[PDB]
Ligand binder design. Structure first.
Ligand SMILES: CC(C)CCC[C@@H](C)[C@H]1CC[C@H]2[C@@H]3CC=C4C[C@@H](OC(=O)CCC(=O)O)CC[C@]4(C)[C@H]3CC[C@]12C
Lengths: 233, 277, 53, 336, 218
């Protein structure tokens, strides 16, 4: 079975250096691009870094560039992120995401366990209105999202991704590229919308739908997550 | 000085040059279009044909323009001759490496490019060095349409000795390569054919002859102006290089005739083009 | 042996079927070809904006 | 024995029956049809990546992805819009003569001189494509294979047999016998109730997937049939054999209808496909180029000439947009 | 002008194109031999002589040169429908039993097979290693029956060497393409341990000839 187990973290002095690792066991690791995605202990998700398949293309976020290095070991199936001079904005949970890119693939499909790192004290804006709405089980619901730039590219895609984070769990892909439903996800979810105006409808909201819902863009780097919509009862 | 036109030989070396423009552009367009550069010999032959054209156009500019333009024409004719010389060296070295192979290196034309670009850039650097040393203002026109190799009678001999020394080193190398190819081609079983020894011998000896006949400026090394300043034009040695380009074309034809994929393309194209045209 | 019995049984199974006229089959092929000629991209060349290649 | 006289009498009965229903010919009915003119097709994409000769191809039902199998031991799934190789599968037998793309898109198949049809799982977890099921059972080489669902595949081999398999169990649920020479092609019907199979004994047999019996049998060619293709109606089919002749038969009339021939062509046909409306008949030849015939009037309405070796595989998309021709010079070309 | 995950699709295509190019330059330094011959000749013997159903592939290695041998004896179908898959083999190893000049002759079926594959459309330049098997039993049965019962034009003796040389020269003049291809004839038996060295010394000349063909000198 697919497993991405991260290691490294804990209490770190400010200004020191650390290195997280992500042991990948259960899949052909050398074909997958890898992402590091951050999550603050009260806020939402934000993208840290991305290394490509075969280490050819490396991208960092603008708020983390220079002092972070993402690397991989393909014979050993491990993914390192070496961080230097940790500030107070870097105390968070770090997730290890895999994503493969070809025609018809589903990026960001599997997410790691995520490790906690506690320190000692022209981008596309993706709004979501934080509408933490209560809902009874059995009825329908619709979560909205809005961008600042048209995500519909010239090729025909609409690079909007929907993620569900349950209480006490890692995130999980529901809808990739606006319309397409991921695998292992029940068909009650539906993504729809036009340029800069998106929505996710759930019909017959059952259990294990309570949680936070995020809308990410993959139109151009850096990848910017929505603020989150926390569905509840 | 005094000189002689000889309109007979001028008509000869005009007809030969306008023949060698057309019979080189036809080969270039045949290699690119109908032959599509699928084989490595198409890369070698397109290099040889473009190096002959780059010489023939320069000689035609020198003979046709009454001004002279001797810096441009002399430099491009030297570039054509030196790159033809090292293309022939590259071909007869590739055959020598083929005879001593062990495993079937079924590789396509990717290491000829590292040779051709290297030869072109190295002769470009060795003519940039000459234009830096001799200077871009020389006025070396010893006669109308006759150009020496620099106005200084010391520097002209000092660069003619360099050119002839490179030519003679290449001729000694082509003699050694043809000897070692025939010796390795006689210890095999497929190689005892007379055609495979005749082609190698007659493309080695022509190279050796035409680069020993370009190195005899090393014999007149007594600081003489015997090749460069004495004008003359009573000789036929002013009108030599038309037949020299024809000899290089015969070398190209002999290289192409022993390569059967080019030959059946020719024999098919002359069948399909002499019917509708 | 027994292969010839199976061969003549197959020939008899093929022999007793219905065979419509060649004019009817030709008219049906003509009607199918002329009924879908508007939706044929290689037959009638579409403009370059409609063309994905 | 006296059974051969019964077979000859029944063959003469069938010949008289199928000669009785020939009320006209296809040419004298299709003279009232405007010709399609000079069809000119240009090489849009040119997918390069194979190293030995390409022996098979198949499009996708989304008409964007295609698969190609070659003799260097590689299947390659190409994105034909952007010429990007989506997948490259290494085979354990370098001698593949057929390949097939599943109509759902999850699977791909290949087979050849090792008599085994391997089924690979494209849309999988854990990344790479891996072998789902090896179907062994034929005793000759595999000449064609075509998916019915994701669990049913019909193969046609060079031991004079076709077979209908079940990819979950792994064994032949049906065996179609009746050919005397090596079966070289196959073409499923649009409704996938029937399929034709052309063989080396110059006969094309219409089978029946549900009841494994030869429904009809057509003859007309003089040499071995190399390629077969259904008309888009599902009522006719065209063959291509080694005697430089394509032939449009018919199922409801049990007879040939039209002969696609030209005296300047003296080489056999390697592959055959139809246009989407059934107006054009595409045919790949041995003299290095493909031909485009008006399927109702029978004349060379076009020539696709861009290959330097023998055109081996050919396929028109499911939306009729393009034509991929793959050949023995290891190139595929997407004409449009 | 490409998207953020069209650039990665192009990068994946470049990486697997690199893998195709690497695996094709690796699998072109392999010597692909094609085994052929009549039934009960010496093919199954010479597979065992050289330290070792569809295509039967046999990999071995002799002095830094990897060999693939494709036995096609179990492909009981039409030879004219899959033989062009082997167009481009390095050499054809054709086995002929010398002790078939009286069996039911049976040397003439082998001569028709040699003439069929030696003058083929697809093997106009493929060299042929030609193994002649069981010479030590062919000389045992040459003391009794003469060679004239299979060769009526044999104006020669019944010596083993003369009969063997006549059989070899009767085989090697079947190629009409005397200049394009060549034949490497050998006399082997069960006690040799040197047939694989003849195979190596005979395909090194085909390797040199094909390297020289790539350089333009055919
Ligand atoms: C003094 C001058 C004449 C030196 C020679 C310079 C050029 C004439 C040579 C040097 C490198 C050669 C190139 C080497 C490699 C190739 C790859 C080849 O690409 C292919 O794979 C075949 C063409 C195709 O299939 O598209 C196209 C020709 C080209 C550019 C050759 C064209 C001729 C070039 C530019």
């Amino acid at each position: 079975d697919v497993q991405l187990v991260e290691s490294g973290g804990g209490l770190v002095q400010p200004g020191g250096s650390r290195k997280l690792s992500c042991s990948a066991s259960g899949f052909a690791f050398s074909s997958f691009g890898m992402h590091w995605v951050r999550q603050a202990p009260e806020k939402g998700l934000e993208w840290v870094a991305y290394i490509s398949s075969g280490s050819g293309t490396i991208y960092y976020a603008d708020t983390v560039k220079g002092r972070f290095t993402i690397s991989r070991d393909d014979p050993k199936n491990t993914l390192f992120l070496q961080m230097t001079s940790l500030r107070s904005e870097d105390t968070a949970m770090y997730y290890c995401v895999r994503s493969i890119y070809y025609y018809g693939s589903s990026p960001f499909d599997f997410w790691g366990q995520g490790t906690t790192l506690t320190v000692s004290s022209s981008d596309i804006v993706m709004t979501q209105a934080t509408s933490s709405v209560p809902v009874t089980p059995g009825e329908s619901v619709s979560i909205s999202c809005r961008s600042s730039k048209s995500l519909l590219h010239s090729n025909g895609n609409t690079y909007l991704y929907w993620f569900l984070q349950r209480p006490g769990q890692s995130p999980q892909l529901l809808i990739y590229r606006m319309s397409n439903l991921a695998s292992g996800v029940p068909d009650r979810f539906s993504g729809s919308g036009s340029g800069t105006a998106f929505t996710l409808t759930i019909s017959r909201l059952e259990a294990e739908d309570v949680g936070v819902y995020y809308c990410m863009q993959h139109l151009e780097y850096p990848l910017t997550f929505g603020a989150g919509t926390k569905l509840e009862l | 000085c005094t000189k002689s036109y000889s309109a007979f030989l001028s008509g000869m070396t005009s007809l030969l040059l306008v023949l060698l423009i057309l019979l080189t552009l036809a080969g270039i367009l045949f290699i690119i279009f109908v032959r599509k550069l699928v084989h490595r010999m198409d890369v070698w032959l397109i290099a040889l044909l473009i190096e002959l054209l780059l010489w023939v156009l320069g000689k035609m500019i020198q003979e046709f323009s009454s001004t002279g333009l001797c810096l441009l024409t002399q430099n491009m004719m030297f570039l054509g001759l030196m790159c033809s010389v090292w293309t022939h060296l590259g071909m007869a070295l590739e055959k020598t490496l083929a005879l001593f192979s062990r495993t079937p290196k079924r590789t396509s034309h990717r290491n000829v490019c590292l040779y051709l670009m290297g030869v072109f850039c190295l002769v470009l650097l060795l003519i940039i060095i000459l234009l830096i040393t001799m200077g871009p203002d020389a006025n070396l026109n010893r006669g109308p349409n006759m150009c020496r190799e620099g106005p200084t009678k010391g520097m002209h001999t000092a660069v003619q000795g360099l050119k002839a020394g490179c030519y003679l080193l290449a001729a000694v190398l082509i003699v050694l390569l043809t000897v070692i190819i025939i010796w390795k081609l006689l210890r095999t079983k497929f190689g005892r054919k007379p055609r495979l020894i005749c082609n190698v011998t007659f493309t080695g000896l022509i190279c050796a002859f035409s680069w020993f006949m370009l190195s005899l400026p090393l014999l007149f090394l007594g600081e003489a102006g015997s090749l460069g300043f004495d004008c003359t034009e009573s000789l036929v040695a002013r009108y030599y290089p038309g037949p020299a380009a024809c000899l290089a074309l015969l070398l190209i034809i002999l290289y192409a005739w022993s390569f059967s994929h080019f030959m059946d393309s020719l024999k098919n194209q002359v069948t399909v083009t002499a019917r509708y045209f | 042996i027994a292969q010839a019995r199976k061969l003549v049984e197959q020939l008899k199974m093929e022999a007793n079927i219905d065979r419509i006229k060649v004019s009817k089959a030709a008219a049906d092929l003509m009607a199918y070809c002329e009924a879908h000629a508007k939706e044929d991209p290689l037959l009638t060349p579409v403009p370059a904006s409609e063309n994905p290649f | 024995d006296q059974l051969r006289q019964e077979a000859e009498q029944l063959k003469n009965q069938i010949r008289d029956a199928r000669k009785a229903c020939a009320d006209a010919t296809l040419s004298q009915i299709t003279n009232n049809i405007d010709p399609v003119g000079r069809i000119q097709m240009r090489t849009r994409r040119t997918l390069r990546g194979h190293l030995a000769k390409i022996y098979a191809m198949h499009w996708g039902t989304d008409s964007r992805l295609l698969v190609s199998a070659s003799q260097d031991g590689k299947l390659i799934i190409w994105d034909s819009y952007t010429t990007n190789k989506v997948h490259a599968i290494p085979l354990r037998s370098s001698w593949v003569m057929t390949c097939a793309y599943a109509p759902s898109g999850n699977y791909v198949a290949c087979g050849g001189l090792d008599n085994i049809c391997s089924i690979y799982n494209l849309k999988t977890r854990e990344g790479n494509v891996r072998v789902s099921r090896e179907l062994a059972g034929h005793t000759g080489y595999l000449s064609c294979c075509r998916f019915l669902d994701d669990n049913q595949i019909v193969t046609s081999s060079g031991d004079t047999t076709c077979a209908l398999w079940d990819i979950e169990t792994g064994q032949q649920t049906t065996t179609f016998t009746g050919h005397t020479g090596d079966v070289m092609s196959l073409s499923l019907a649009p409704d996938t109730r029937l399929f034709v199979s052309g063989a080396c004994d110059a006969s094309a047999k219409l089978w029946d997937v549900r009841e494994g019996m030869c429904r009809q049998t057509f003859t007309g060619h003089e040499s071995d049939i190399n390629a077969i293709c259904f008309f888009p109606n599902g009522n006719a089919f065209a063959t291509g054999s080694d005697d430089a002749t394509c032939r449009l038969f018919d199922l409801r009339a049990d007879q040939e209808l039209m002969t696609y021939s030209h005296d300047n062509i003296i080489c056999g046909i390697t592959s055959v496909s139809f246009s989407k409306s059934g107006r054009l008949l595409l045919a790949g030849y041995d003299d290095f180029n493909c031909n485009v015939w008006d399927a109702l009037k029978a004349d060379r309405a076009g020539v696709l000439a861009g290959h330097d070796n023998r055109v081996s595989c050919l396929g028109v998309t499911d939306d009729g947009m393009a034509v991929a021709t793959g050949s023995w010079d290891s190139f595929l070309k997407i004409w449009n | 002008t490409l998207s953020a995950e069209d650039k990665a699709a192009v990068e994946r295509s470049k990486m697997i194109d690199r893998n195709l190019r690497e695996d094709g330059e690796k699998a072109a330094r392999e010597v692909k031999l094609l085994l052929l011959g009549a039934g009960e000749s010496g093919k199954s013997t010479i597979v065992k002589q050289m330290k070792i159903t569809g295509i039967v592939e046999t990999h071995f290695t002799f002095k830094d040169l990897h060999f693939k041998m494709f036995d096609v004896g179990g492909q009981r179908s039409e030879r004219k429908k899959w033989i062009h898959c082997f167009e481009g083999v390095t050499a054809i190893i054709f086995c002929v039993a010398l002790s078939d000049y009286d069996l039911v002759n049976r040397m003439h079926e082998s001569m028709k097979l040699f003439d069929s594959i030696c003058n083929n459309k697809w093997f106009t330049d493929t060299s042929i290693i030609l193994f002649l098997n069981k010479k030590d039993l062919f000389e045992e049965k040459i003391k009794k029956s003469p060679l004239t019962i299979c060769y009526p034009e044999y104006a020669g003796s019944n010596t083993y060497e003369e009969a063997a040389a006549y059989i070899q020269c009767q085989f090697e003049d079947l190629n009409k393409r005397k200049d394009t291809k060549e034949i490497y004839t050998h006399f082997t038996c069960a006690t040799d341990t040197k047939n694989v060295q003849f195979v190596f010394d005979a395909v090194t000349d085909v390797i040199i000839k094909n390297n020289l063909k790539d350089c333009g000198l055919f």
